């Protein structure tokens, strides 16, 4: 009769479909920062992205 599992901050980590009772894991979609690698502009202007 269990339905889902919560983490610390009321963040659900499971779900059961109302039609077909199945266990489904859930994870957040990716995010992060973007940085630019740049040599001295007195030498060149070619960069890289991380």
């Amino acid at each position: 009769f269990q339905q889902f599992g919560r983490d610390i901050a009321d963040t659900t980590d499971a779900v059961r479909d109302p039609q077909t009772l199945e266990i489904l894991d859930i994870t957040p979609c990716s995010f992060g920062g973007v940085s630019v690698i740049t040599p001295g502009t007195n030498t060149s202007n070619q960069v890289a992205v991380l």
């Binding site: 901050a9 963040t11 957040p28 992060g32």
Partner: peptide, 23 residues
Amino acid sequence: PSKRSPIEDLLFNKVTFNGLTVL
């Protein structure tokens, strides 16, 4: 596998994303 002293190994053995990350 990692070039550690026995004392270092013992030391390392004893010590045990909601918008925020770790680096």
